[model samples]
Target: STGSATTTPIDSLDDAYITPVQIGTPAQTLNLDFDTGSSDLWVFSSETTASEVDGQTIYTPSKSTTAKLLSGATWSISYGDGSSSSGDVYTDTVSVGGLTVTGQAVESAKKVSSSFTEDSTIDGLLGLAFSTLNTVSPTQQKTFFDNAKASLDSPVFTADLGYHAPGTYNFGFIDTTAYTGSITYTAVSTKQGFWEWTSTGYAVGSGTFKSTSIDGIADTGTTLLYLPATVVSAYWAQVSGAKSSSSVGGYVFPCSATLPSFTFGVGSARIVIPGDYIDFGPISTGSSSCFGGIQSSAGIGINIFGDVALKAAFVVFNGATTPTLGFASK
Candidate 1:
């Protein structure tokens, strides 16, 4: 009586994973980016402005007999990357994997900024963050996971983000074979509507692991790892010829320079990010310099353990009364 789903990476930017979901009665599909950093199930739809619509697929509420307008409801969101979207609301049957939730609030975008419009592949975002972060005006809407949690065997999801390869996102269950060693569980603080946690410490290369606490979130939507300026400086210092460049943004170094492995503490276990992963390739095509994958969080306040860090390990986003995170080598 429980249900779950899995998603594979589509051929697009390495920024996020996209999965197909059935929306409305006749089950029109949309490729949604499952984001844990925010909570809103907004999508490009028939309501979207014609000029804003590019090659991106749009959901047609009229095509679905079960879809209904939520009269005065509306939603708008601005992402850290400067992308924004806003639109009216509709109630429709939403299904992910094998689980389906009836009457789920689906915000259909009437307007989208240039940032979102340029990326024509991603139809919309499927937020997995707490429902409290939902941006609907009149009443907050529940996430697909929240609405279907009652029927799930266990309120849990696992993220298997592979390194430059396709991975899986499993809902309602965990596959032990997907990870190695024991799963090190850490208590998460969700006060900010993020899967926030404090890292025990960090180290550059094989340097001593400092026990300083670093507050950060596990954001699947983000592409690279972002740490405090001080931490970022220290790591780059170890790399010969690495320096902060105002022109290129963040730290950059000669592509020939050898990069060091960065390690982060998770309770007692350590997650090591390989050096090649840190060298985020060339800053531009045919350029002699490359950008460091690890950069300063700077104005963002908290560190972001994005795909660069998550891909190094198997992660579990537990959905219990007191949600926790479980980590193990992939």
Candidate 2:
């Protein structure tokens, strides 16, 4: 009765992961970004403007006999990174992993921003956020997870992201074999439609752990770990030749600079993000400088523990009771 699927990184860029999903009755297949930062199951479709389609595979609703249009209903969504998509709504059968939900709201994009249209590999977005965040207009829609929750053995899903490797997204049940050690649980506040929680504190290298409460969201879709400006500066200060570069748009240091480990606190548990992970690779090919993966939250309202942070630990998104986040080392 449980559903599980593999999520693979598109490249060494490690910005996002893709999962195969089936939509509509005849089962139009698409490789979608399993994003935890938003709540809309949208895809490039027949409705998408041809000029903006690029090389993305589109879902043709006419091919699915079970597809039903929601007249006058529409959806528009913009991500934190400025990627956006807008379209009309259709109800159809949607399947993820081994789970299926009938009458799932499938937002077929009619317009897409350059950020998305240029990314030919990302055909759509499968949101795992709370159902309350669904962007369908006129009447909000429920995500596949929400619709399938009632039938699941437990309202839970685990995110096991990897570094330059394949990972798994497990639903309904926790696989004891996926992680090692005890899983640390923290209470989450979904008021912002995010898996938001207060990190106990963080430290760069072996520095003292400051007791600052960092309130942020665990976003799988984001590539870097975003923290406060002061925190980012403090971390880079520990490394030589590290400076804020306008051209790089973040903190950068010599490519050969020896980096220190970064630690994030979840309750009493301390999770260490490896030194190598902090160096997000060179600013450009053959460049002598590299960008630090941990950067300032800046204009963003809150910090984001994105893929860089989540990949270091096994995460459990507990939908039971008061929505808890569980973390464990792999």
Candidate 3:
């Protein structure tokens, strides 16, 4: 039988948002985005002389009265987006949502690519996904999720992934206040961590579905739902093959099309994704041309679910539980 699912509020923004545990014995302030896309702890420090300034948040270890640096192990990550950051390793007490984690491994980038430089509000990325993608390479020392697995409650964490609320993404414990039901369960494909896939297929309204398509990790970190061309094509075929302009910035369809309800199942829980989840705002290209449902991939394997799909269901990442991946609500 299909299991029921709902979303619940776990922690308040003030509560779920872990304050950075000061770096060094003293302390420093660095705002980082918790990401499930990769496993690596890195922060943008004032020490690095990089040009990534768009969404970059600055980490000031010196500003804090209590800050210390680890011996000097360098670290770096090369993202599929053609962006990379490299810096020295340091030990610090990182805090978030008011929780304090001591000796959290972090990389202070000394070198960064242009893509990172363009993100003006982003300071650095804190990978909460899995240990496999850890740049540390030892199969260990991935990020907070890896370290938190042994100590956190339920050996698991919930992400509110607020797709609508100020784009605020909450980590640790599923927030039940958002929806209703139970959490869904699925065994992860070991070969790929951040890039895992589920046999579950997608459906519109309540009709039958084709072979289940695999989905990527839902990192509250990203803002888009990336799918293969075929997936988008299938979805558009149902509503109307209204062509999306190549120059637009978002998925462009006749705003009047009868948008159907969408649901994707994991284990027994089937998450119902809303229609507005596809809104990409106004188009920046194609003379206001509509953006296609599925953007053409650069041939990379990283197909992110982003906010488009995350907003529809409640997600629980069990870093500790034997079953591993759980999706549900309430």
Candidate 4:
């Protein structure tokens, strides 16, 4: 079977993307981040502390007749942004778009950090990475993708993230019309529970492509593109006033500065991120200082090809016997 769902940025910054997911018998609709960087479908729920609840839509498992407590199953997840959530586990019917899955593991949060509570745009995160990353204890669980992959006509899913616009996540099949040119396939490493791959290299604006082999993960859940410090420095140098700030905590420049496009390689294919896309927006609303969308991975320990890079192209997460990632121009 094939399923298609529309995913849109939660805010103007494109901080993260959210897709409406139907959970339970009555289908409690929750806007969830389809995260490719982790493996745990967690949600804010009735079990969460009242103080932790904000304007987010919470999933009350009690309302779902189909919901079943998973005996002793429990889960917890920490994020790179320092946000985290953990809670009990329940199995229920969950659907995305027109596709439905029975007995899907729905983690109901009992506690959530301030970061999650403050951002009301997303009710939860649905992980699409390898099931090995699942945080459940006592008994691990499969991701929404793993459980549904077998039922799908093709063992794959696709992500098309757009800048300041709506995009889509398609399951079971790849929509060729969503992109142009032939897709370039690269070997993926699931040992890290991520869709990690070795990129050919990157360049700034119209500069030539660098042949360095940079390994990174394609994560729709993350907000920015993080590469090696040298690569990030090279890109920032092109902007006249750009400077890495200790106080601001990232490279920033005059809001009026003209930014350059960033191009990265996927095997032999080269995908370019528009210059405007690199302008992540101002340091503050109406502020003259703008933060960059691409940053250094020096501290993070891993380079992340997050929304900033993913939105520049069409990506296919082919869950074949030997998984591979396919990229094509939009």
Candidate 5:
């Protein structure tokens, strides 16, 4: 029902993209990297240096005569990775897939250096994550959801991560075809825009190879499923000859072999993340190497289940419902 990560030159727009949801009226289009990693919607603008704006969606103020700018205000977004972007502040009537909500928060920057900006296909980042992480510092009166929530029904937002089939992220409507269970809602922490969650344990190649439990947070901004390196190594050991290769940097493995599916837990819920998402290319990094799954993070307590984990579930977030994260039909 719900289905997939990586860094490196990933330039797929519709895959894990961004969409600017404007306030009022009907004009919404998908924006790339609309990352939930932070809580702000940042877009490129015509005024932006053409060199830096390359491959990103720049909202031309001239195109939508109604767009407004937060005079003298500026913002900069820096992620856990060295990736960062900085720009002046602007507010506009944003539209996404024809769903227009007015006064939407958008960061129009003149410069960005993240891999997102490097990708020529990414138009901009719509930070749908949390408000506490807004890069619009000092004078903070804007949030992507703050300005537009008043105009939406139920004021709910959701990302259908697993509906990797055509038209799921295409039309703004998440097609619930592959799910087999009712969605269970969890309370979202009030501190930030991140959709943090708790998983019970880990599994490999289906829910069959169960192991010691752990906790995780689901984020669209991150590109991989980061976990303890030791645990990840042990996980592959369960699969006979999964070996790491030199060229691949991390846990390199065979891509053609019969790889087993991996699983993670959210409380009583169990989510299965497909293994194909890990492969760097169609072929394996090595003839018979261990493809990476959970790679090491520098002793960071924040282990995450990025898009790879989100793509397997129907994630519905109800902003109106305080302190809680909701899920809809899968």
Candidate 6:
């Protein structure tokens, strides 16, 4: 079996994307962030402190006939950005698109950081990365995708994100029509518990190829591009009046400058990120310093090809005996 779901940006700047998911027997639908950077499928639940819920939707397991508490199991996910969520565990009937899982792990958040609390647009996060990254203790639960793969026509999934419009996520099968060019597949390393792949090469605007490989992860939650400091530096250098601004906290350039397109190769496929995508909106409200969407990964310590790059091409996370990543022109 296969499933398809629409994921739309929560904000105009395309900061985060959400897909509607159904949980429990009667279908308590929630808009979840399909995060490839994480493995735990967590959500706001009635068990959470009322004051921390803000305006986001919550899942009440008690209302579901199929809900079963995973006793002695708990989860705690903390981010480097000082955001965190800790929760007890439950298994419930969950469905996405046209697919359903019998007893999927539905982590119920009991406490969340202020960032998650304030984001009324996102109910929780549905992790699509490998199950190896699952954060359950005493008994690690398989990811939703991993559990559903057995019923899928193929052990592969596709991501199609857009800048100005909503995108889609195809589970268990490749939407061949989603891409126009022949797919260029590359090996993936789960060493870091991500869809990690090596970019064969890159070119700045119309410049010649650099012919250097860069290793990075394919993450749907990350809103921008995170590359090597040199690659980021080269991209900003082509823009007029571009500089690293301490006040803005990243590379900023004149708003009206002609930004160069960025091209990165995966095997033989060349996916070009349009200049407009690089010109990320203003650094601050009513500010003229345009913050570049592509930033140095030095600070994060790992390069990430996020929504900005993912939307530029059709990506397939093939979960075969030896997992691989495929890229193609849209």
Query: What C-alpha lDDT, on a 0 to 100 scale, does residue 294 get in candidate 6?
Result: 90
RMSD of each: 1.7, 1.2, 6.0, 0.7, 5.1, 1.1
- Identify the superior model by lDDT, candidate 5 or candidate 6: 6
Candidate 2 structure, TM-score to reference: 0.97
Q: How accurate is candidate 1 locally (lDDT)?
A: 0.87
TM-score of each: 0.95, 0.97, 0.79, 0.99, 0.79, 0.97
Best by lDDT: 4
How far does residue 31 in candidate 2 sit from its true spot (Å)?
0.9
Q: Taking the tens digit of each residue's C-alpha lDDT, what string does model 1 give over 98-185?
A: 7788989999999999977887778999998888899999988989888877777789887887666777777788888998898899
Which candidate, 3 or 4, has the higher TM-score?
4
TM-score order of candidates, top first: 4, 6, 2, 1, 5, 3
Q: Candidate 3's residue-wise lDDT over 1-330, tens digit each?
A: 011112222222111122233355444555565667778888777767845555556666666444456564667788755678887766667755544566677777777788667655456777876677777532246476556555554466655554344323334555567557776677665467663657377676666765565656665555556666676666666666456455553346765565565666676567776655665533444343334334434356666665456655656666654536666643
lDDT of 4 by residue, 1-330 (tens): 988999999888888899999999788999999999999999999999999999999999999999999999999899998889999999999999788899999999999999999998889999999999999998999999999999999999999998999999999998989999999999999988999999999889989889999999999899999999999999999999999998999999889998899999998899999998888788988999999999999999899999999999999999999999999999
lDDT of 2 at 86: 97
Each model's lDDT comes to: 0.87, 0.90, 0.58, 0.94, 0.58, 0.89
Q: Backbone collision count in every prediction?
A: 0, 0, 52, 0, 46, 1
lDDT of 5 by residue, 1-330 (tens): 111111122333223543334432233343446566677676667777777765554566656666677787788877776777788876667555545545666677678775655666666666666676777766664555555566554466566653333323322223346355777776566554567665556777644645555555667667667776765776667555566555665665555555556776655566666666554433243354444645655355777767666666667656665745544334
Candidate 2 RMSD to the real structure: 1.2
List the candidate 6 regions with Cα displacement exceeding 4 Å: none
Alpha carbon lDDT at 282, candidate 6: 78
lDDT of 6 by residue, 246-265 (tens): 77778899887878899998
* 1 versus 3: better TM-score goes to: 1
Count backbone overlaps in model 6.
1
